[PDB]
Amino acid sequence: PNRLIVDEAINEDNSVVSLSQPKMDELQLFRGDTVLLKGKKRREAVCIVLSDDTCSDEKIRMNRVVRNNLRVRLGDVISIQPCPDVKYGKRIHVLPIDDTVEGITGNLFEVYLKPYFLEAYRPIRKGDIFLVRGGMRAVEFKVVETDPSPYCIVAPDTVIHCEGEPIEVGYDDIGGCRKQLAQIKEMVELPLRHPALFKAIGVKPPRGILLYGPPGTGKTLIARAVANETGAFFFLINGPEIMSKLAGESESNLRKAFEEAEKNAPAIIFIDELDAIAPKREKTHGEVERRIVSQLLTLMDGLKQRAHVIVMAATNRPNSIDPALRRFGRFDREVDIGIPDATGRLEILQIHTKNMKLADDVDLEQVANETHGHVGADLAALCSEAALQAIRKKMDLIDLNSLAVTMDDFRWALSQ
């Protein structure tokens, strides 16, 4: 209910997240309310909430600064809750990210921090990374210490302090597709284990592999387990995140990936959501479409027959891909990752129950027998839902340590 789907910000201020008014009614939240947001890797953020007409009810708009702070991507899920008692900080300790101040000199407070905090009453959290644009260069800063202990509102009396400059998966975690896993393991073994045997043998190595499927089939898991277990560097590109950037910010992203894939070769570059980058758009005379596909086809034709860099990309719509990708032996292999059958679900459920103490009465095959249109992502959620119901049961035993999960807990999860 307070779980929301991360969407792009139109309100590109650091301190502002946006929900729909119907959602804001269901949580009894008002404009200008300080809210606490929870994301992945135990990361938290403090924002002001606002209305936005152009926003699906299940989603939250938040800029790239906050998304990085929450360690979350577009399409991921965060929690939101009211944060009423944020007091005014007395003094904050703030430094700049060295990546961003290299080769600049000047009064960092006069150029950046003063006009950023000035009469804004910003909420800040220890460990935040914030970007301040303007000033011939955008510098990113970090909150190392607050005067309230966590949390603070940077009010005029708050004093600012600035000195210095700061800076494994595997095959046994993949179930339900023991076939397609071997088919990728095989496309990739020779080019990542024995690259030079391709000039010698005289054969053209794979450069791109398309993984087809619906969301949740585990296509990112497959790719990362192939990279960790053949000894390959792994570089993830998220389709909508790179597209969210300015052309030029993304061009720098895309280059960096191939730069690092060759600096660390053998490497696998993985492109989640290929059709965010390379749609089957029409083509007319205009300045208005950015030429990211061409950058990508240029970087991939430039890898040539070295075979130490393989590029995998996944999509939910194969007939929706720019045909240029499938020519000149760029993307000329494709494996399909579907819903698992009954045996596949059971495979997945043993993987997700791996570090959960299971009751004697647990029949994981019955759970499997009743999970049809389910993909691995839904089977994962079903297990955590069951362990959550186990925790809520020990929670009710305050009627006056660890946990144990029963088939009733699963029966609760199968009924949402």
Partner: protein, 200 residues
């Protein structure tokens, strides 16, 4: 800006600068690679000391390739492309064995003595590829001009009807043949990119 290397059969590399920001002619298209690599085929050769006009030159890819095989080529595109065309000429001056020069030529307008070849790559894609382009092609072309047109068969929205009409108009002043896929470069070829020849 990101640089396409375009490898030649003899080992030298053409390098084409590309811009992720401008109009459609700021990146190298695959019909450019197909055409360029086809000029290098054994059955083609024969460009040396010959006159080449390239329309829709964009990045200069095809015209520059012909400039390195011994031809005297003029790469033409709109005013927005002249600085790229010139930048890309400077990038490859060390490989030009005939001659190359950038000029402005918007289709449907006029600016010599008829050229030997006219080379086009991926020029047939919107309104101006129709009445204005055939005007320019009907003009520049002598009777012994070999116009070579390379383009990607596209399937989306406005692109297939432009390709349909464009051949419904080419019959009015020109005879054409499509050269078979197997005369294309062995590797840089694709069932959906067409090299077609024109005369008259």
């Amino acid at each position: 800006m990101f640089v396409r290397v375009l490898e030649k059969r003899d080992g030298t590399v053409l390098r084409l600068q590309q811009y992720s920001s401008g109009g459609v002619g700021c990146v190298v298209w695959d019909a450019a690679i197909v055409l360029s690599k086809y000029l290098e085929t054994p059955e083609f050769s024969a460009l040396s000391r010959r006159s080449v006009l390239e329309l829709g030159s964009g990045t200069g890819a095809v015209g520059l390739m012909a400039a390195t095989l011994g031809a005297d080529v003029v790469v033409t595109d709109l005013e927005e492309l002249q600085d790229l065309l010139k930048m890309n000429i400077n990038m490859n001056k060390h490989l030009v064995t005939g001659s190359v020069q950038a000029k402005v030529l918007k289709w449907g307008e006029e600016v010599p003595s008829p050229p030997d070849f006219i080379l086009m790559a991926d020029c047939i894609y919107y309104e101006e590829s129709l009445e204005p382009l055939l005007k320019t092609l009907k003009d520049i072309s002598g009777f012994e001009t070999c116009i070579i047109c390379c383009y990607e068969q596209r399937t989306m929205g406005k692109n297939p009807e432009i390709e349909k009409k464009y051949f419904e108009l080419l019959q009015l002043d020109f005879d054409f043949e499509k050269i078979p896929l197997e005369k294309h470069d062995e590797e840089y070829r694709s069932e959906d990119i067409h090299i077609i020849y024109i005369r008259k």
